[PDB]
């Protein structure tokens, strides 16, 4: 889901 990408990017960095 495209609307999940920023969440995953944020988690990957956080």
């Amino acid at each position, epitope marked *: *889901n*495209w*609307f*999940c*990408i*920023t*969440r995953w*990017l*944020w*988690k990957k960095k*956080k």
Partner: antibody
Amino acid sequence: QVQLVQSGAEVKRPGSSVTVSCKASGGSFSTYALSWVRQAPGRGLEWMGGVIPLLTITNYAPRFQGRITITADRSTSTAYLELNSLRPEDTAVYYCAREGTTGWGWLGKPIGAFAHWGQGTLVTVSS
Amino acid sequence: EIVLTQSPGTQSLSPGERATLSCRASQSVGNNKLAWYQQRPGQAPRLLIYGASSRPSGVADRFSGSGSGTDFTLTISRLEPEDFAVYYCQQYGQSLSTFGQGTKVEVKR
């Protein structure tokens, strides 16, 4: 405090193309989803597509694939919407909206839903 | 291609009254990613609820959202003058996001 400022009103002839801009300020640009929603006079909201600046990851609604191009310049925190082969049916106010962030602050984990909206840009398509 | 249904399209209610709005989805909405927006005439939409039930900071508590799967509901405990407007529900459970046609809440007098 996320503020989105869109370019001014446009008047186009059918078949022509239009490019509307959206400059963000008051937060980070790259790591947040930014979409384009439109609303025809007296009608409902329509999600058109979006982009994640960091890797220019675009997501277009099938209905516009081929006529729509969404870009984003990280150097100026500005996103763009280009719509080609305009038709009177495309007459509408176009809004750019950025997803909100968890709880307080704005560096929290994105929420997907559109919390920030530009002022809107009226694009008229007529002869 | 999730179709969102909001009905009635219009409701007439008295001030201070409670309001409940419905939003049906053709298919299950992924991760319950359902959101509600408020839009007053001449103004841009405003996010009221996201994640089917999370109220973002800066939004009065008289606004509550519920539901899951394909059934969802927005509730306004008491309608203040500024609450009479159009409400749209959107689902972002998949790459192709969609909005309902909206429900308009007018003042019954």
